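Purpose: get a first structural picture of the assembly so the mutagenesis plan has something to point at.
Setup: five entries, given in the order below. No constraints added.
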Amino acid sequence: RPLWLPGSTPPAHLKGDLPGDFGFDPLGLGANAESLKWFKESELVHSRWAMAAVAGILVQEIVRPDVFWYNAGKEVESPLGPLGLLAVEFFLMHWVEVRRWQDLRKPGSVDQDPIFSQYKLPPHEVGYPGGVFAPFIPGDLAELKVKEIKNGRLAMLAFVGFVMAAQVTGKGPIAALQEHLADPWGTTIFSKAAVVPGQAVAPPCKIPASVSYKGIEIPTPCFLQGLWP
Amino acid sequence: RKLWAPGVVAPEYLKGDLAGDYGWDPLGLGADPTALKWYRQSELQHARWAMLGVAGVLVQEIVKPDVYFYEAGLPQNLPEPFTNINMGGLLAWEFILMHWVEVRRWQDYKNFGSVNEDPIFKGNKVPNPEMGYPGGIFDPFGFSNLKELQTKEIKNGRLAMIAYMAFILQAQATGKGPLAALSAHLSNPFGNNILKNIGTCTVPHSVDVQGLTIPLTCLWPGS
Amino acid sequence: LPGDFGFDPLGLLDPVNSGGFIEPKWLQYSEVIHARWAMLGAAGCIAPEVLGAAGLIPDATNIKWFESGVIPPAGSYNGYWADPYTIFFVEIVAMQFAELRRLQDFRYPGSMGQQYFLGLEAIFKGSGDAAYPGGPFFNLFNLGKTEAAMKELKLKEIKNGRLAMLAMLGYGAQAVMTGKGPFQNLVEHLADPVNNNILTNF
Amino acid sequence: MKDFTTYLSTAPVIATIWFTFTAGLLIEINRYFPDPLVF
Amino acid sequence: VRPVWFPGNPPPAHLDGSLAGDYGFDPLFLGQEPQTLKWYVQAELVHGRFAMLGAAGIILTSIGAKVGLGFPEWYDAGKVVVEKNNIDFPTLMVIQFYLMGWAETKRWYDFKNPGSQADGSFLGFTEEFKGLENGYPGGRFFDPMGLSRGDAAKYQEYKQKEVKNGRLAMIACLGFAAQYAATGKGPLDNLADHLADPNHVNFATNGVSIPI
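Result (structure tokens, whole complex):
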């Protein structure tokens, strides 16, 4: 079995049934199956969120450059009332999330379109609605799920590294890429900072301070500033 | 069998099965077998490393007899192609690749026979007969007898460890390469010796790198 | 037994009703302990003076032993890489460990070779006798594999140690009276076995 | 240890400690609240 | 056979090695009695966890201080924050009192009666206030991640590590108290100082600790 370590031994509760495992849980927290399903769900959740996020940020930096995706929160504009937008947002989200959670806590219990009785989703797996939720399927879930989880974990890493690269350079990830390409040698946190018993150094942040939006003036500190190297 | 001293007795476990043995474990450290393998691996480690070290310092002292290897560590002390590189990226590449290969050797010691193949070009594997003895591609000419090979290896390696440490101390004292120190003892064996040079090392007391200064050290409070 | 010339006037070797640390084992144990200490002390006090007399060592060295600083009133040396008390601290903890484990032996033989001590436990089996552990360390070389030469070494150790204790007494007494180096006093009494004596120093 | 607990539950030592406690109570009382006459 | 706190001597009777951190150390036999011993177990656990809290907050704040983040020195921090804010010291104190009192009282009467606190007399919860062991209230709340309910072996190891780091944190916070009591400075400051000159930055240089 392909393992996250060549030549090592998987733990107890890890075998390989669920895709995306290769015997990795050094803390062995996958003991309780309840929390384990909980965490499978949560990891799928985060992976999908982050995949969507990186995709959107990338394509947007592409087509509409010079718009700091990080500062889109600030510099967005729309004639619609922001309060109404966030209201619709909250309510929509409360609904969808309570649906998914009610189904998790009680499997196969909400599978119907409660409006159109004709419409009702077939039986499926928690974390795998499908049917209408997956109408067209080329290939096999055997590979689809493994690719899903792989790409999702990778995209989580992508998103967080984008955030770091912004906090350190303020540049969009593509800008930072072109920068790295320009100087392969000097474009490294290595070439940016280091720590020694004599003295320590860290790169300064580009996210300036409390952002002054339309009256609120959001306090904008840094992520764990003092321990960046 | 000649032991490590005329008339001395050997410990029960020292049998010469490992080369360079003479029955010398005055502090019984070779009691546990696990730790014994650990320590043999490390001994070979240090012997080989110091062998390479004396080799390098020697050949460079010969070819460019002005570098003063003890000070060659500086970016200014770098050859034509690159002498003002970023120590940042230097450390980057170095640490990455070394951490890899060290984890490889570590998995080796942990499970002898575990990772013998090239994990990608799977038509590629080296058979390891002994812990710390890869061979195969690591032995391009396949000289493997192996016993006297190991004897000469371990013996010369211990001695090279000693020699390299000697070079370090002599450099701290006289601020000069072993070449210079030997020429000194030859110009005068009476003069040019530890009896005179003693009690004062030439430690230049915390030189400064591109970004900062590094604290400096001497083996004794000679200063 | 070694060094026994019947020299026990008050009869302290009386076995009956023994106890405390008035007990032949601990007694001779302490004897050889102090004897070895005195050997070391003779070497220590004597070395630097004659060493500077040979000039092989610097003149910053070779101050009279007591002028080290152990008694700062008697004079101290400076050039020590750290503070007197700085040294003294780690010195305390080190000897604490050493003496403690030695005593743990003396009270419970071999009982320092069981709890994990970095593999140095076969070294700490010693023997069934304090002051004579042996083991791979405390006997590097098998010197005295015969018991005749063994006891020979034992007696030699005893005589040498008692004599060295007497030597330490002499060192202290002279350095108090004349306030000079013992080596100084040697050179003096050699200049005059007649005019350089304790009688002269009155 | 239990022997010790019993020794402390012995009588005169208990009388002692109770008296000490009361006396320290009243001395501190007078310390922080000097010169009481009425109320 | 287990490594004694003091090699060579045998351990006491009421000390065996059943609980984590047992190295046979009760030279004063305070745990001769089972009830008192178990009580002491719980007390040591509580105090060690508190010390862990203390050390963590201290070190964080001290880093924030030394690096230019404007974080006050801990021993000043309470005063400075109550001053920077419009908070009322007695109000803070009394609310904190309320809370710690209620929770600690629950713990107290659970030590008294081992299981009466999970009866569901509380709002609607049951066994979520049920102690797994003395001083080990492992439940859905005090162990939502359920480490205790898997690999009891690694769990015991974790108990070992817990008491270990707890005694470490206790001695650490005492150390910090001492560092300030001596130098009047930040412990991280004094740290960098000993870094500067171990040969000449120490209590022996303070001359206060050792009064010579």
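The radius of gyration of chain A is 22 Å.
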